[PDB]
Amino acid sequence: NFFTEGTRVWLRENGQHFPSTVNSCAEGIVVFRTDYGQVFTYKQSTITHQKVTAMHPTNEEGVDDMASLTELHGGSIMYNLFQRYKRNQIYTYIGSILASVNPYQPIAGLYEPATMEQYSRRHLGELPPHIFAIANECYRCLWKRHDNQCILISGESGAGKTESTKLILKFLSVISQQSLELSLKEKTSCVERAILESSPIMEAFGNAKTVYNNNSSRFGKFVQLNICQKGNIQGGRIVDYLLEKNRVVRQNPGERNYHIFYALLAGLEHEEREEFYLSTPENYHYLNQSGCVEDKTISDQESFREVITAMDVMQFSKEEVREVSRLLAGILHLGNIEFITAGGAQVSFKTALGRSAELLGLDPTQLTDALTQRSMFLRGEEILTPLNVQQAVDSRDSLAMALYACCFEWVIKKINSRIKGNEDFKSIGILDIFGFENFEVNHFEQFNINYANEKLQEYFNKHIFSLEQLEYSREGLVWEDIDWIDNGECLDLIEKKLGLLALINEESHFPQATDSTLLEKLHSQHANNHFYVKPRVAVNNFGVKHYAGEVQYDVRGILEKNRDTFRDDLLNLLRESRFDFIYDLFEHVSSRNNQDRRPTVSSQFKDSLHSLMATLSSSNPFFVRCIKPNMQKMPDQFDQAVVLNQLRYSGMLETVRIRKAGYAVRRPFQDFYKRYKVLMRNLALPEDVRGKCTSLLQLYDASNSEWQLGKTKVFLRESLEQKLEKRREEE
Ligand SMILES: Nc1ncnc2c1ncn2[C@@H]1O[C@H](COP(=O)(O)OP(=O)(O)O)[C@@H](O)[C@H]1O
Ligand code: BEF
Ligand SMILES: [Mg+2]
């Protein structure tokens, strides 16, 4: 096991194989330097085989498809991504699955229109791996397959899911324009322009700075593009999931509120700024509590200009844009209302109340009364009761959240109205969720986000491993099952009867229950569950062993957040608005007054995720796995421990194994024969269809290792299908 200076070796250390070089070998000491800059020293006598092994020559600053790898260990997989990342190749295939490592910098030529053009005219595998090749293959599947397609993008907060989604949309929008024979109706619709302009609007209203991402998505998005038989986008539909409405009124230290507030304050002209009584973001409680009002990566004034342009494309009138500006200004002033205790909560600093009442079209005495008192009618006289200061603050904040959430819903409705079109043929759906996040302090918001990420990982495992191997078994293929990391029991802990969501919902329906009584119930029921953590010291927390790591959640605020109560006194007040825009938002809204069962945030979200997964189940999926190379948002900094952790927990190692050994493409015998009949013209074919399929497959892969015949289908590897598709097009 002796290797001379400069020899390339795999060094087994710290539970992995390190790509390394022999630095020195003298006086019975051997020093290895890893490609990651770690230096490991040993007594030469202690080095044996398997501990140190020679590395396979070159093979050669990486491989494009990791199913091509001979060494399948985590060290080999990560080294391939590292070699490629160092030369700005952030994309690697695993069959048709795409790995994307966030470069945290622009890369010359990578997303230029000349590159988009090049990918549109090639087959998957002909060019270097790229998100444009996946978008193109997905698009080609609308004529190669019989179903709708979907692209699902996974990753922690900051991994690159939102950037990936926008790149796919830009590529499809460009390709939609290449389509023939483009009618004047379809050329003048500007529907692709509107679809692309939906992103700056939704990011301004739904994204915010967090520790993991200066542009974190605080809602989930599913974008459906309806494509005609001729290949042109006819229109689309956007579905939003669980906006983080509590961000409007409170943020963690160092975070910001939604981008749009800072854009509005930096972007409005002096006249409109004075009309809405607006000053700097520091002047507003809803924007100043976190201690951060700016970020060097964001020009808030430039974002405002971008939002204005996008809203014009989206057919928001100039008056509608002003109404949205006025509502946001009203919310900012509302947040500055302070209360003192005399009775009874009383408004202290009356200026903010007067400004907010004017901007919201409310009478100031009516707004003061609604925030400081509760009303009830008893056959048939009104009985006014004082609220305390915490109840007045909760009322002020619920008003701010309701205004923002209804305004966001209206914005999404307007986008959907603009991009609405025919659905005559097929669709491509793209899922952009909020990513996995584990902060210093996690609340109900992180619980819901991490649950959605857990659900998406279960969806990835179901398609890549579970349904895939079940199909091989049902078809009678020669196959040895590949084990995978199954997160099913974590979802069972969250979703089953007596599970986390069930207990949270049950406690929410009890008026006397508190976050403290909820925690006692969570601990009592689940202390022995392997996926649940009862903290030894942190008295306000519970933990969940998520697929992406253990997360501790502070229970404080869970019941109030889950109930999501809105006082009928405030709903009645909003309906008094003289500002038609505000009245229109609350005109037909259902009552959510405290009860003395109504859907909760958890019950509606569980239903929305189950409905989403059902939509995705009917489509053919493409998977993109975004990987963060480091936790410092740095370019050219591949932190191997951070990368390896994501590769391992996400099941990338087993994914390479199943894509390498398995057969991801399948067609019934007659379907295969009818599709590729042109490629069989020089073959002496037998009478039976199974024999006809075998003759073509043996011609294109004589090793007989890239395909198998099942009971009803031909099964083949993606590399063989790409080889057959390229030749079919040529003929
Ligand atoms: N492909 C990319 N090229 C360059 N920078 C990128 C790329 N993907 C992401 N980034 C950088 O990382 C940041 C976070 O990416 P984003 O897509 O918002 O993450 P996620 O949606 O997964 O939370 C971006 O705002 C940008 O600075
Ligand atoms: F912060 Be990312 F949108 F997950
Ligand atoms: Mg995002």
* Local structure of 156: helix, strand or coil: strand
Burial of 223 (0-12, 13-18, 19+ CB in 10 A): buried
158 CA to centre of ligand 2 in angstroms = 5
Is 576 known as a binding-site position?
no
Q: Is 213 a catalytic residue?
A: yes
Q: Tell me if 435 CB under 6 Å of ligand 1.
A: yes
Q: Which of 95, 220, 435, 651 is catalytic?
A: 435
Q: Tell me if 486 CB under 6 Å of ligand 1.
A: no
Q: Which ligand is nearest to the CA of 155?
A: 1
Q: Tell me if 603 CB under 6 Å of ligand 1.
A: no
Give whole-number Cα distances, 18 to 13, 41, 348, 644, in Å.
Answer: 7, 14, 64, 11
Euclidean distance between CA atoms 361 and 343, whole angstroms:
27
253 CA to centre of ligand 3 in angstroms = 20
The answer to whether the CB of 490 falls within 8 A of the CB of 450 is no
Buried b (16+ CB within 10 A) or exposed e, 654-671: bbbbbbbebbbbbbebeb
Q: Is 435 a catalytic residue?
A: yes
Amino acid at the residue 330: G
Hey, what's the torsion of the CAs at 277, 280, 281, 285, to 10 degrees? -60
Q: Tell me if 456 CB under 6 Å of ligand 1.
A: no
Euclidean distance between CA atoms 547 and 648, whole angstroms:
10
CA count, 13 A, side-chain hemisphere, 157? 24
Nearest residue to 725 via CA among 149, 122, 151, 130: 122
The dihedral of CA 134, 623, 645, 68: what is its sign? negative
Closest CA to ligand 2's atom 3: 217
Burial of 48 (0-12, 13-18, 19+ CB in 10 A): exposed
Q: Please count the helices (runs of H) and the strands (runs of E) in the chain.
A: 28, 24
Give whole-number Cα distances, 247 to 189, 212, 219, 285, 359, in Å.
Answer: 36, 16, 11, 12, 21
Euclidean distance between CA atoms 519 and 532, whole angstroms:
12
CB atoms within 10 A of CB 378: 7
Q: Please give the span between the terminal C-alpha atoms of the chain, in angstroms, as a whole number.
A: 54
Q: Which of 92, 148, 217, 508 is catalytic?
A: 217
Site to substitute for ligand 1 among 163, 211, 217, 449, most atoms within 8 A of C-beta: 163
Q: Which of 96, 154, 207, 213 is catalytic?
A: 213
Euclidean distance between CA atoms 233 and 223, whole angstroms:
13
DSSP class of residue 245 equals G
Pocket of ligand 2 (CB under 6 A): 157-158, 161-162, 213, 216-217, 434-435
Task: Give the resolution value in Å.
Answer: 1.8
| DSSP characters over 377-428 | EETTEEEEEEPPHHHHHHHHHHHHHHHHHHHHHHHHHHHHHHH----SSEEE
The answer to whether the CB of 20 falls within 8 A of the CB of 9 is yes
Burial of 173 (0-12, 13-18, 19+ CB in 10 A): middle
Closest CA to ligand 1's atom 17: 160
Find residue 546's DSSP bridge partners: 549
CB atoms within 10 A of CB 593: 13
Could you give phi then psi for residue 201, rounded to 5 degrees? -65, -55
Q: Is 217 a catalytic residue?
A: yes
Q: Which of 136, 162, 325, 694 is catalytic?
A: 162
The answer to whether the CB of 356 falls within 8 A of the CB of 323 is no
Burial of 188 (0-12, 13-18, 19+ CB in 10 A): exposed
Number of the ligand 2 atom closest to the C-alpha atom of 217: 3
359 CA to centre of ligand 2 in angstroms = 33
Nearest residue to 250 via CA among 212, 208, 219, 220: 208
